[PDB]
Design a protein around this nucleic acid. Structure first.
Lengths: 56, 209, 114, 122, 120
RNA sequence: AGGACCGAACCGACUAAUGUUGAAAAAUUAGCGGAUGACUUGUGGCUGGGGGUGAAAGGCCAAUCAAACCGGGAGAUAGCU
RNA sequence: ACACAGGUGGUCAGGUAGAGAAUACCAAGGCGCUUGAGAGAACUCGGGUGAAGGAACUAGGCAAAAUGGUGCCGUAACUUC
RNA sequence: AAUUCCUUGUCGGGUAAGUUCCGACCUGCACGAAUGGCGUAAUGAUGGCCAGGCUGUCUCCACCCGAGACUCAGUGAAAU
RNA sequence: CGAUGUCGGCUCAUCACAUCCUGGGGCUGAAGUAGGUCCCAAGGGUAUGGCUGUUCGCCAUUUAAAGUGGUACGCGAGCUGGGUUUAGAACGUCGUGAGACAGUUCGGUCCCUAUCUGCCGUGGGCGCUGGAGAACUGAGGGGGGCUGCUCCUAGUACGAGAGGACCGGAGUGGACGCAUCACUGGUGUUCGGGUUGUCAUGCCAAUGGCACUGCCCGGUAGCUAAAUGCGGAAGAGAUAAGUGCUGAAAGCAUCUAAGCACGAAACUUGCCCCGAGAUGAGUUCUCCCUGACCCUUUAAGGGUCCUGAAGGAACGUUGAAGACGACGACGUUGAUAGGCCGGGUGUGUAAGCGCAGCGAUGCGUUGAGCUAACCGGUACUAAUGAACCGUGAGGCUUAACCU
């Protein structure tokens, strides 16, 4: 194997730029409250999409 | 001249009172309704576009419905274009089914390649394999070298590569036609054809006798 | 698949006399050999019958005259002149694969005793 | 399946009992044998007055196989063991005077009608 | 590849797979609530949902049944005594899944199992 | 009666897959030779580098062998990279 | 080297099967491992089941497999007895 | 021949074909009686050759239950 | 000499040629069977066993040929390790002796996590200077080319006898590339049964696990040859060699000079196949977006509030599509999948009961009970609605159109 000095940041960043594809979707408002929630995931009130999921 | 699109629905043996069982493929056509004829100043060529499946209106978009606007949209499962002769034909009021071959005994098949995951070599091109007794370190399923040792240069194209199956034509150049029934959309070709129950399958006039 | 079973409703036959593996069926057959179409007989026990519909083989083997003498009568195809279900077996291992390892009195099937 | 060194039974009388295959006798990159097919043979078990010598190399024709014949439709037909008939190396035809079993009707189809012209019934 | 296999894998051997659900079905009947990962939550239902219809369907050897698979004799302290016909009268859909996903600082597909009718 | 003899542990490391900046300074796996003996093993001790100890292999002698470890003579000596 | 897949003297020897500390299922008693959720591709590795041939493979039946238990019946040449 | 370079020594047997095996000959470049002679029972991780058993090494390989490879979260090297 | 791992084979190809078979012909001490030899020529093709490391050579039986060379004496980050060439043992010859010996025999542990180039599949980005969507054209460049046996021409010409034809035609098999699970077999720890030991089962029954699926029988769905099939064609065009016609140099003669027609596995099409990063980055069909204000040594940009079309995108419910991404179905304007109902199958007739037996254990209810993948009905269960991404008719040239 061989690698000369260090990989150039111009090529290393060009290999990082597809590594996770992280995007902003601003989140959606909950269907029972005035605050935003994570897609298909439970809220802090123990609710999801108009119904109760867990006790408080 | 033109082809027909018609899925395989299964395999069976059709039988005769003459004492032969005759293996066949079973096809059921739902007809191809024609969406564009290409003629008059169409970039130097003549053709016909058929469409085979059906697509639901809440899935069809405004520019997709625009591709079929010479007769109207039904779409689904593919387009299929065939080369056409001169004759000044209309696109509307046309449709093709099994009567395209109701007096033809010999047919050409193009089944398209099927899913086989990785496919690799042994399940792909029938390459040779070696037993696990003594030595042979990590060399049991090798391609006999794809290229050659140094002196003759770069990798030659005589040996095929390992990889996924799809998009290849997979032709069968000549099959016998056993039954056609126009008002049942029924077609029975002799023996087995490439692809499976979800595959779309085309048949064309034979260029060999 | 049901789409080719809808076609099998134009290929199979349902009307058959009741018989199972290890029974004798004493069929009359031609084998389609010789100009004078001479009617012949078949002897042996049923080794396969049902349940593949159209593809149920209906296989009979002589078993008392050495190797061979085994034929496939296809259940539905018109190739038999008469069929006579005579001797009844008693089967709990109905594949009859022990007939490939036994000869004579040990290859002869239980007498269906009551 | 019948190949190099395979031992066959003799279906004809007083020449030999057991004989060995050395060629399937059909050209290059060849395999197997069937009914009415020629094979190159060696005598391995001889008869005290028999007219073919022990260790001598001759020809035969195959008449029974355990792998059987698949040419018919539906029925696959198999035969008793692996058996052949000895051929004359200077005057053509079989050399035996008696041949065992009823045999297949396919033995007429090229050169071997003498086999079914004797005591066999099919 | 997977040219016909539709059975759920869980890591580890198949007798561990079957034994884990043989235990956790006892936990489900004992506490009447269970939260766990989606592959576990869905495969837990197998061979025990057909016991709800075994309250209504004409049968033979009714007490050798519900004991040739799962093989538990503490589930019958409640099954066919305080649980059966009042869910067979609905024909399917006896249990909830409430899939919400994740754990604390960790991604695993969490589901929260309970009956389709549960007093609060 | 017996260096009889099968078979584990117990003593070995012969067969093949494996490892050889390893689970390891030689053992992970299944077989294999010996298995109350010219056997093995816990404790204590004896024999010491031109000196030991070997059914004695140019084997072994605390990571070191046709000759162990240490500091000193020592910055031996090098018609040479 | 390590909160090590190793090594370490002695005593106990439970139920059933078995000749048995071979070997398996259970007691007294101990444990489910001081990183998890998975995905269901080759390739690699541990392991299984096989029609009809048959040593034809290879340096070589290596490796693998049928074999394998003892009750009675039976057992050649050779011999330092 | 643990010995013969010069040769696959030869005749008989073994196979269709035997530079290898067994038997016989002397047709030994330099064999031979303590740098020992002739041969055998027992013993063997046994050289070689004949025949059989049985077999996925081979005809011809096919399918299968797991563990890495593969994905994410945690910790995290080297020859070069 | 600061390394290039040296034999041959196994395995697998390419190029060169004075061509072994194949395609086209000639000459003969070419009847025929053939054998021999020279061109036109390197596309398709070009031994199985026994002894041998074989380099060679010998032997048994075959063939469409048993043609010739190049390639680090072709292929060690492929396979083999008999040979080369170490370390152990011993014998023979040479020496007084350590030692020597392509002397002889049996032989002898061998590394690794492809960083870089190339290649398949596929994401992310660049690209056509507005965006989006569904499809096709295919410039051009490759693949694939080879045969026996049988019947007929014909046992006819030729030939004591035996033997035996070329020009053509058809049937069918092998070799070789692919295809498919219908049929035929193997497999199948998601399904039923038998069975040794033991545990669970309160006890016994009849029942479920564990011991390598404990062992042994059967096996649906899938997968695959030992199973079953399709295919490498003929013509067409233009040519070399060669066959020639007419005709000079050479009053003749001449296939060549002018004139001019044929003609091969070669050339090019035809068959098969890829291809627009074809930066020569194409065209086929179509959808949609048409506001003000402030400022400047400005035709170039900044500053403010506005912008939502066409169409994409994350998570669901999922799929014999799949390493992750990609890809098919479905997403209430709903059957995408589980559950339920039914159809479908496999196993082998149980439990209990009654009859027969002292009993093991049968027989009648009973093809009993238990039971995988096929695929119709049934919203019972489960697919969150808003939201998020995406922008304002796009510089120049020009035929034409509207005004």
């Amino acid at each position: 194997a061989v690698q000369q000095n260090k990989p150039t940041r111009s090529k290393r960043g060009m290999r990082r730029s597809h590594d996770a594809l992280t995007a902003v979707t601003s989140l959606s408002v909950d269907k029972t409250s005035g605050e935003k929630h994570l897609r298909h995931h439970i809220t802090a009130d123990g609710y999801y999409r108009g119904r109760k999921v867990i006790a408080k | 001249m033109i082809g027909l699109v018609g899925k395989k629905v299964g395999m069976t043996r059709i039988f005769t009172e003459d004492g032969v069982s005759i293996p066949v493929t079973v096809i059921e056509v739902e007809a191809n309704r024609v969406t564009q004829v290409k003629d008059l100043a169409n970039d130097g060529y003549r053709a016909i576009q058929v469409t085979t499946g059906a697509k639901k209106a809440n899935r069809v978009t405004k520019p997709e419905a625009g591709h079929f606007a010479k007769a109207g949209v039904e779409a689904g499962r593919g387009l299929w274009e065939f080369r056409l002769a001169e004759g000044e034909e209309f696109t509307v009021g046309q449709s093709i089914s099994v009567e395209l071959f109701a007096d033809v005994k010999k047919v050409d098949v193009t089944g398209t390649s099927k899913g086989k995951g990785f496919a690799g070599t042994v399940k792909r091109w029938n390459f040779r394999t070696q037993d696990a007794t003594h030595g042979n370190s990590l060399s049991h399923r090798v391609p006999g070298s794809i290229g050659q040792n140094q002196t003759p240069g770069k990798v030659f194209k005589g040996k095929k590569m390992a990889g996924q199956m799809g998009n290849e034509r997979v032709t069968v150049q000549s099959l016998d036609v056993v039954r056609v029934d126009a008002e049942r959309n029924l077609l029975l070709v002799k023996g087995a054809v490439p692809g499976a129950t979800g595959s779309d399958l085309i048949v064309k006039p034979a260029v060999k006798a | 698949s049901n789409i080719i079973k809808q076609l099998e409703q134009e290929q199979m036959k349902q009307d058959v006399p009741s018989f199972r593996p290890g029974d004798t069926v004493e069929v009359k057959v031609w084998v389609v050999e010789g100009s004078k179409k001479r009617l012949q007989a078949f002897e042996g026990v049923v080794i396969a019958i049902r349940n593949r519909g159209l593809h149920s083989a209906f296989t009979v083997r002589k078993i008392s005259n050495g190797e061979g003498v085994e034929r496939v009568f296809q259940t539905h195809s018109p190739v038999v002149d008469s069929i006579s279900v005579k001797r009844r077996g008693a089967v709990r291992k109905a594949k009859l694969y022990y007939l490939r390892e036994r000869t004579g009195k040990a290859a002869r099937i239980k007498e269906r005793l009551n | 399946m019948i190949q190099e060194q395979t031992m066959l039974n003799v279906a004809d009388n007083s020449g030999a009992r057991r004989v060995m295959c050395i060629k399937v006798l059909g050209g290059s990159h060849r395999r197997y044998a069937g009914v009415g097919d020629i094979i190159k043979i060696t005598i391995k078990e001889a008869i005290p007055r028999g007219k073919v010598k022990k260790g001598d190399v001759l020809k035969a024709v195959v008449v029974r196989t355990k792998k059987g014949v698949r040419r018919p439709d539906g029925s696959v037909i198999r035969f008793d063991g692996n058996a052949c008939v000895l051929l004359n190396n200077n005057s053509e035809q079989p050399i035996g005077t008696r041949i065992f079993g009823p045999v297949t009707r396919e033995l007429r189809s090229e050169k071997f009608m003498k086999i079914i012209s004797l005591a066999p019934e099919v | 590849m997977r040219h016909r296999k539709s059975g759920r894998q869980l890591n580890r051997n198949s007798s561990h797979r079957q034994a884990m659900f043989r235990n956790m079905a006892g936990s489900l009947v004992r506490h009447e609530i269970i939260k766990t990962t989606l592959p576990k939550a869905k495969e837990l239902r197998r061979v025990v949902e057909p016991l709800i219809t075994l309250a209504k369907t004409d049968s033979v050897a009714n007490r050798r049944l519900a004991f040739a698979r799962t093989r538990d004799n503490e589930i019958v302290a409640k099954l066919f005594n305080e649980l059966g016909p009042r869910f067979a009268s609905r024909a399917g859909g006896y249990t909830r899944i409430l899939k919400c996903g994740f754990r604390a600082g960790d991604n695993a597909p969490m589901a929260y199992i309970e009956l389709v009718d549960r007093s609060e």
